[PDB]
Amino acid sequence: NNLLRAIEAQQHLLQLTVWGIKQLQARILAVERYLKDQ
Amino acid sequence: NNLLRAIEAQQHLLQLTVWGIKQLQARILAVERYLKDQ
């Protein structure tokens, strides 16, 4: 039961990292586009 | 026992990714601030 609970919590932690990476990809793409345009 | 050991190792791998994302968020924020200031 502690193992299932750990996997559940780790999945939430994984989702947070996936969402964070998506945010950062969009932010650096916005910067690269700005610099290209300038 | 292999499952507990795998969850332990995966938690270390998750911590490394969380730390890495924090580093990158700070780096792109520093760049966005530089560009705003310029």
Binding site: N2, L3, R5, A9, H12, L13, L16 | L4, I7, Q11
Partner: peptide
Amino acid sequence: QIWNNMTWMEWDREXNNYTSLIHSLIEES
């Protein structure tokens, strides 16, 4: 859908909270 600074500080809190729980679960085992 662009997270601001406060949303990133909530992200950090939520990551700390899940990490603390997982540490306890793996120890308690």
